[PDB]
């Protein structure tokens, strides 16, 4: 199972780790992808997870979009986890670099409550432009299920832990 995680709350855990390496090690039931509405997995966590699946995640995602149209910002869909997890929960956090409403970050985290346990990144953090300290606070105050957060950046991980209320 999950190892080396620091417990933040009753249900939120955090580790300085690459979510792709973490997924290959643990093979969780659910890995969360930091998706966009088009499921175009170009960069950040999405690009890394997709590259780990040899582009199978992108092929599956394009078929999903062709059938269903784009997701909503704050929404999600469950697709295959390929070689990383049983399932991938593609969650769209607001991209503040695209002028999207940051109030939608709580709606994005609410998707995690449909799964008992998840391996996840901080939503809207990194290339999505939001403050990761704010994302962790919204995560802790929204998610009630067991969430194992993988924070790639060491310096950000230390800042998140040392500033956690
Ligand atoms: C989380 C995570 N895992 N691997 C990455 N490249 C990220 C980011 N950002």
**For the chain, domain boundaries:** 1-165
Name residues contacting ligand 1 (CB within 6 A): 18-20, 44-45, 48, 121, 126, 150, 152
- Which segments within 48-160 are labelled E, that is strand? 76-80, 87-92, 117-120, 146-151
Structure tokens at 87: 């399932």
Structure tokens at 85: 């997890």
Residue 151 CA: nearest ligand 1 atom is 1
Resolution in angstrom units: 1.1
153 C-alpha vs ligand 1 centroid, how far in Å? 7
Which of 5, 13, 19, 153 has most ligand 1 atoms within 8 Å of CB, for mutation? 19
SS3 content of the chain, % helix, strand, coil (to 5): 40, 20, 40
Report the largest interatomic distance among the alpha carbons of the chain, rounded to a whole angstrom.
45
- Return all residues near 66 (Cβ < 8 A) that are at least 6 apart: none
């Amino acid at each position: 199972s999950f190892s080396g995680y620091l417990k933040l709350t009753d249900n939120v855990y955090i580790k300085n780790a690459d979510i792709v390496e973490e997924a290959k090690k643990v093979k969780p039931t659910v890995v969360v992808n930091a998706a966009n509405v088009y499921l175009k997995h170009g960069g950040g966590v999405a690009g890394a997870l997709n590259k780990a699946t040899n582009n199978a995640m992108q092929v599956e995602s394009d078929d999903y979009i062709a059938t269903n149209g784009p997701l909503k910002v704050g929404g999600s869909c469950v697709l295959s986890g390929h070689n990383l997890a049983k399932h991938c929960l593609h969650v769209v956090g607001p991209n503040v670099n695209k002028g999207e409403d940051i109030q939608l970050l709580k709606s994005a985290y609410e998707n995690f409550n449909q799964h008992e346990v998840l391996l996840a990144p901080l939503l809207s953090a990194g290339i999505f432009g939001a403050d990761p300290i704010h994302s962790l606070r919204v995560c802790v105050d929204t998610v009630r299920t067991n969430v194992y957060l993988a924070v790639f950046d060491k310096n950000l991980y230390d800042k998140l832990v040392s500033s956690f209320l």
